[PDB]
Design a protein around this ligand. Structure first.
Ligand SMILES: NC(=O)c1ccc[n+]([C@@H]2O[C@H](COP(=O)([O-])OP(=O)(O)OC[C@H]3O[C@@H](n4cnc5c(N)ncnc54)[C@H](OP(=O)(O)O)[C@@H]3O)[C@@H](O)[C@H]2O)c1
Ligand SMILES: CN(Cc1cnc2nc(N)nc(N)c2n1)c1ccc(C(=O)N[C@@H](CCC(=O)O)C(=O)O)cc1
Length: 159
């Protein structure tokens, strides 16, 4: 199966200027926990923000254009990307915008990080529709020394 993994602030805002308007070390942690050992599909922009491969996971990139780091596997099509994974039980789609937009429909599970912060952003998340999804997991956390905002994890299966 396919899965999207994202962190959303208030208004489904996912980021500003090739960045994330926040800093939650704890999300990264949860993020990694959820991805370790699985293939991650990302996009040229996302990729560019990461800047280096992600250890323990198969880094697949989407670019219309030519691969520019031999360390990571590049692709020119959703189908390619999807191909590039293989016989795995779960493929993780890690962003950004456009990519989410495109795989949402194929997804069957979501790992969300609801961040309690109202911030302006230029990229929002694909509008999912409640009806379809069944929240099967939540986990709250208050802001801290390091995670300046409170946040909540959630897991939803497509009903
Ligand atoms: N908050 C989170 O949960 C989360 C997770 C990831 C990313 N993000 C944020 O998302 C924002 C950036 O996302 P974005 O949508 O602008 O970029 P993106 O999806 O990361 O990058 C888009 C690039 O994908 C390539 N592409 C996409 N679909 C393709 C396809 N089917 N075939 C070929 N190439 C394809 C194009 O590449 P070319 O250059 O090859 O034309 C396109 O410019 C950021 O601020 C980032 O930090 C947030
Ligand atoms: C910019 N970006 C994309 C990013 C970030 N947080 C997200 N958070 C969630 N929940 N989902 C995403 N798709 C997501 N994507 C990043 C940036 C850094 C790392 C990264 O450093 N990951 C380390 C975590 C520890 C660290 O940064 O030192 C890992 O090993 O997975 C991952 C994604």
């Amino acid at each position: 199966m396919i899965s999207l993994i994202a962190a959303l602030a208030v208004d489904r805002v996912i980021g500003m200027e090739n960045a994330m308007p926040w800093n939650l070390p704890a999300d990264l942690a949860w993020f990694k926990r959820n991805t370790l050992d699985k293939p991650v599909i990302m996009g040229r922009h996302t990729w560019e923000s990461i800047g280096r491969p992600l250890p323990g996971r198969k880094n697949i990139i989407l670019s219309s254009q030519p691969g520019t780091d031999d360390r990571v596997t590049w692709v020119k099509s959703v189908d390619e990307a999807i191909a590039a994974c293989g016989d795995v039980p779960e493929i993780m789609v890690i962003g950004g915008g456009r990519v989410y937009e495109q795989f949402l429909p194929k997804a069957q599970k979501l790992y969300l990080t609801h961040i309690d912060a109202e911030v302006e952003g230029d990229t929002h998340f694909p509008d999912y529709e409640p009806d379809d999804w069944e929240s099967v997991f939540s986990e709250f956390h208050d802001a801290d020394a390091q995670n300046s905002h409170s946040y909540c994890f959630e897991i939803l299966e497509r009903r």
